[PDB]
Amino acid sequence: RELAILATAENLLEDRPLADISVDDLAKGAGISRPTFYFYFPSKEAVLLTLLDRVVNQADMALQTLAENDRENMWRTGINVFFETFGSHKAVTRAGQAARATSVEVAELWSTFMQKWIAYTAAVIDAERDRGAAPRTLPAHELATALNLMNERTLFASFAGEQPSVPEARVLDTLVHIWVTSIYGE
Amino acid sequence: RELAILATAENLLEDRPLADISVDDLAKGAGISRPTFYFYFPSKEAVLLTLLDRVVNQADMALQTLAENDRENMWRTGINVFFETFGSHKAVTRAGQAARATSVEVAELWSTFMQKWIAYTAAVIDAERDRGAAPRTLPAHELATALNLMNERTLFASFAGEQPSVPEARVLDTLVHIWVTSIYGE
Ligand SMILES: [N-]=[N+]=Nc1ccc(C(=O)NCCC(F)(F)F)cc1
Ligand SMILES: [N-]=[N+]=Nc1ccc(C(=O)NCCC(F)(F)F)cc1
């Protein structure tokens, strides 16, 4: 019944925003009363927080699976965790990013996982540098930061079909070229 | 007295958000009545729209001034229009970007100037390609799109001191390295 509230919320986020979704909306959808809903979640806001948390941890688990196992393809594979994971959860992604402005727990969750993915990118760049494959150019953590923020903005513009945006079928190739040239280039 | 409302709004946006600023707040600040304010602007929302419009057109005019007059330094100079212009107007920038979610005129204004700056970046890349200085890699307009969205996200993260972000004193160098390597690199 927790799963039913979450699934009902993911569905309703595909045809309208959170503001236009009532607790009763979520209650009916999971086939429970308004008050029974409140036993599982304090708000519709915490329902989005739980969805976002699950999408983010799926991405994070998938990037850990890669880390335990050519260079252009290694970066493609890692960028593709975020493309596939968030691209399969477009409504949660769109509503997650919107809720950063108004929910401190959404902003902190997003902030924590971004710190973690930048720290991972920076360790990979330093490892490529230590073994002589990439040149010592920018500080690794500053380059990591900017490449991760590029992906956030560019992936989410594409998913939401913003103008402007890279077409979704061209965004992976676009990002991989920019990562690989800026990491290996002089 | 129009200038006085705008200046009062820019000032009050430095210590709190638009939501926490009343029409009376703006009225008092410009030394006029609430009703006299409404002769100049229909809302506090349209006051932000006019500020944003002026900041954006300053950036756009400054990038036109460059276009009418080494390669790493040409890109630095262009990226520096956005760093300096928006970095001198941090509160307007922060509140402009927030209002994209809730104002269709803010989103359309931002959308139009981004289309225009991407179209400019793409023409410069194609011009560099035609004269043999840059290789034919990604489609120019797709690379332009992603580099412009990188700058939006990275500049605004830095200005607002988000975690994570590039430190403000390192963000220009960071972006120029990523533009130059991805535009000229193989
Ligand atoms: N291998 N390698 N490691 C990688 C590869 C790609 C990313 C990334 O694409 N981050 C973007 C994060 C998000 F904003 F959520 F999209 C991070 C680490
Ligand atoms: N020469 N050259 N041309 C250029 C150079 C830099 C930009 C840019 O930095 N765009 C970012 C636009 C904003 F998001 F507003 F920051 C655009 C065109």
Side-chain angles (χ1 to χ4, degrees):
Chain A
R1 278 206 305 193
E2 192 177 333
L3 296 195
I5 297 169
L6 294 171
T8 292
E10 194 156 4
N11 272 248
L12 292 176
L13 282 166
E14 284 185 51
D15 53 294
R16 49 187 208 272
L18 189 66
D20 297 15
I21 293 173
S22 68
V23 170
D24 312 286
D25 274 326
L26 295 179
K28 167 216 120 163
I32 63 172
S33 68
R34 165 187 183 84
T36 293
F37 166 107
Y38 279 115
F39 179 78
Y40 291 102
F41 295 96
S43 37
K44 49 179 199 170
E45 285 82 18
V47 177
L48 175 54
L49 173 72
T50 304
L51 290 168
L52 187 55
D53 185 301
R54 271 145 51 82
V55 173
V56 159
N57 276 276
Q58 196 189 316
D60 189 59
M61 277 165 98
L63 181 71
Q64 263 180 256
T65 301
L66 285 182
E68 287 160 30
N69 307 356
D70 80 13
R71 64 194 203 184
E72 161 158 17
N73 224 53
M74 162 188 83
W75 291 112
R76 187 179 307 278
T77 293
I79 302 179
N80 183 64
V81 163
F82 298 97
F83 180 72
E84 277 300 320
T85 304
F86 289 112
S88 298
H89 294 287
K90 282 179 167 72
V92 170
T93 306
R94 195 161 188 163
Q97 299 303 298
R100 286 169 70 186
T102 51
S103 159
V104 169
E105 317 191 52
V106 169
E108 288 186 344
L109 175 64
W110 189 258
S111 186
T112 306
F113 276 85
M114 289 296 279
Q115 288 182 62
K116 175 167 195 227
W117 300 327
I118 292 178
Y120 184 64
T121 299
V124 177
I125 289 165
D126 280 328
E128 290 296 81
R129 280 167 184 198
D130 288 342
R131 79 177 181 80
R136 290 170 201 296
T137 50
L138 294 182
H141 198 271
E142 292 163 11
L143 174 58
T145 302
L147 293 180
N148 275 249
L149 285 179
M150 182 176 57
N151 286 14
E152 179 184 302
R153 193 69 196 95
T154 304
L155 288 180
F156 302 164
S158 284
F159 293 157
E162 290 174 9
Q163 207 161 82
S165 64
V166 186
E168 189 171 345
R170 292 290 315 141
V171 70
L172 189 51
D173 281 349
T174 299
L175 294 181
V176 160
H177 159 91
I178 296 165
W179 278 56
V180 166
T181 56
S182 71
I183 288 166
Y184 297 102
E186 295 266 46
Chain B
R1 278 206 305 193
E2 192 177 333
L3 296 195
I5 297 169
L6 294 171
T8 292
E10 194 156 4
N11 272 248
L12 292 176
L13 282 166
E14 284 185 51
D15 53 294
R16 49 187 208 272
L18 189 66
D20 297 15
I21 293 173
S22 68
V23 170
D24 312 286
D25 274 326
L26 295 179
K28 167 216 120 163
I32 63 172
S33 68
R34 165 187 183 84
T36 293
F37 166 107
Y38 279 115
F39 179 78
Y40 291 102
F41 295 96
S43 37
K44 49 179 199 170
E45 285 82 18
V47 177
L48 175 54
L49 173 72
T50 304
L51 290 168
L52 187 55
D53 185 301
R54 271 145 51 82
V55 173
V56 159
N57 276 276
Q58 196 189 316
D60 189 59
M61 277 165 98
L63 181 71
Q64 263 180 256
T65 301
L66 285 182
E68 287 160 30
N69 307 356
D70 80 13
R71 64 194 203 184
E72 161 158 17
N73 224 53
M74 162 188 83
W75 291 112
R76 187 179 307 278
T77 293
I79 302 179
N80 183 64
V81 163
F82 298 97
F83 180 72
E84 277 300 320
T85 304
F86 289 112
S88 298
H89 294 287
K90 282 179 167 72
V92 170
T93 306
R94 195 161 188 163
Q97 299 303 298
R100 286 169 70 186
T102 51
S103 159
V104 169
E105 317 191 52
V106 169
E108 288 186 344
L109 175 64
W110 189 258
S111 186
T112 306
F113 276 85
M114 289 296 279
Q115 288 182 62
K116 175 167 195 227
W117 300 327
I118 292 178
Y120 184 64
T121 299
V124 177
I125 289 165
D126 280 328
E128 290 296 81
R129 280 167 184 198
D130 288 342
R131 79 177 181 80
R136 290 170 201 296
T137 50
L138 294 182
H141 198 271
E142 292 163 11
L143 174 58
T145 302
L147 293 180
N148 275 249
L149 285 179
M150 182 176 57
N151 286 14
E152 179 184 302
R153 193 69 196 95
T154 304
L155 288 180
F156 302 164
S158 284
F159 293 157
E162 290 174 9
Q163 207 161 82
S165 64
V166 186
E168 189 171 345
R170 292 290 315 141
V171 70
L172 189 51
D173 281 349
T174 299
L175 294 181
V176 160
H177 159 91
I178 296 165
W179 278 56
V180 166
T181 56
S182 71
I183 288 166
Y184 297 102
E186 295 266 46

